[PDB]
Design an enzyme around this catalytic site. Structure first.
Site, PDB file in Angstrom:
ATOM      1  N   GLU A   1       8.063 -10.953  -4.007  1.00  0.00           N
ATOM      2  CA  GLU A   1       7.243 -10.366  -4.596  1.00  0.00           C
ATOM      3  C   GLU A   1       7.669 -10.524  -6.424  1.00  0.00           C
ATOM      4  OE1 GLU A   1       4.350  -8.994  -3.437  1.00  0.00           O
ATOM      5  OE2 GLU A   1       4.805  -8.808  -1.571  1.00  0.00           O
TER       6      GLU A   1
ATOM      7  N   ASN B   1      -4.271  -5.293  -9.972  1.00  0.00           N
ATOM      8  CA  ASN B   1      -4.704  -6.216  -8.753  1.00  0.00           C
ATOM      9  C   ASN B   1      -6.293  -6.571  -8.586  1.00  0.00           C
ATOM     10  OD1 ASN B   1      -2.376  -4.584  -6.548  1.00  0.00           O
ATOM     11  ND2 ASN B   1      -2.008  -6.741  -6.788  1.00  0.00           N
TER      12      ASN B   1
ATOM     13  N   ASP C   1      -9.181  -4.895  -7.963  1.00  0.00           N
ATOM     14  CA  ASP C   1      -9.205  -3.989  -6.968  1.00  0.00           C
ATOM     15  C   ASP C   1      -9.686  -2.568  -8.650  1.00  0.00           C
ATOM     16  OD1 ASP C   1      -6.450  -3.017  -6.535  1.00  0.00           O
ATOM     17  OD2 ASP C   1      -7.181  -2.173  -4.636  1.00  0.00           O
TER      18      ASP C   1
ATOM     19  N   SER D   1      -6.216  -1.597  -9.031  1.00  0.00           N
ATOM     20  CA  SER D   1      -4.616  -0.779  -9.062  1.00  0.00           C
ATOM     21  C   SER D   1      -3.564  -2.003  -9.237  1.00  0.00           C
ATOM     22  CB  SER D   1      -4.883  -0.499  -7.065  1.00  0.00           C
ATOM     23  OG  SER D   1      -4.633  -2.322  -6.035  1.00  0.00           O
TER      24      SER D   1
ATOM     25  N   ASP E   1       0.534  -3.276  -8.691  1.00  0.00           N
ATOM     26  CA  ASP E   1       1.786  -3.279  -7.849  1.00  0.00           C
ATOM     27  C   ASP E   1       3.099  -2.783  -8.769  1.00  0.00           C
ATOM     28  OD1 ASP E   1       0.094  -4.265  -5.845  1.00  0.00           O
ATOM     29  OD2 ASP E   1       0.384  -6.249  -5.918  1.00  0.00           O
TER      30      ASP E   1
ATOM     31  N   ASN F   1       2.495  -0.611  -4.178  1.00  0.00           N
ATOM     32  CA  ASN F   1       0.817  -0.452  -4.895  1.00  0.00           C
ATOM     33  C   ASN F   1       0.324   0.903  -4.527  1.00  0.00           C
ATOM     34  OD1 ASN F   1      -1.790  -2.265  -5.042  1.00  0.00           O
ATOM     35  ND2 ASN F   1      -1.993  -0.413  -3.776  1.00  0.00           N
TER      36      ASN F   1
END
Ligand SMILES: [Cl-]
Ligand SMILES: [Cl-]
Ligand SMILES: [Cl-]
Ligand code: NA
Length: 129
Positions: free
Chosen positions: A35, A46, A48, A50, A52, A59
């Site tokens: 990650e 991301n 969309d 959002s 992380d 998220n």
């Protein structure tokens, strides 16, 4: 902060992640590796809109507040910035909520694609735990 592999394993163990929801420590270290490469300052935007955050790329759609993810929730009750701290407490506490949400560690796509079913004990091999 960029953790060393055993350093992070120690910190995770001290915060009670080891065998949490039945996931051994090496699962959690493997997930962090893929990650964030063990960097608490990691961020990823991301598609969309959002983001992380942190060692476990948690998220903003559900888990933390960043003020710029319309419609999202803040189920860990933290600013997303808390997830970038050198101290992993916030990230661990939030991860415990995530992994309890029904899908276990499949919540982390990268765990599913890169850790699940593999020899995850290798990630803690040699650590003085
Ligand atoms: Cl393990
Ligand atoms: Cl928001
Ligand atoms: Cl599970
Ligand atoms: Na949010």
């Amino acid at each position: 902060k960029v953790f060393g592999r055993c350093e992070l394993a120690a910190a995770m163990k001290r915060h009670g992640l080891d065998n949490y929801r039945g996931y051994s420590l090496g699962n959690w270290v493997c997930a962090a590796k893929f990650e964030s490469n063990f960097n608490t300052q990691a961020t990823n935007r991301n598609t969309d809109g959002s983001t992380d955050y942190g060692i476990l790329q948690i998220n903003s759609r559900w888990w933390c507040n960043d003020g710029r993810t319309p419609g999202s929730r803040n189920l860990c009750n933290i600013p997303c910035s808390a997830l970038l701290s050198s101290d992993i407490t916030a990230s661990v506490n939030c991860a415990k909520k995530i992994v309890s949400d029904g899908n276990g560690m499949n919540a982390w796509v990268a765990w599913r694609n890169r850790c699940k079913g593999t020899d995850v004990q290798a990630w803690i091999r040699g650590c003085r735990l």
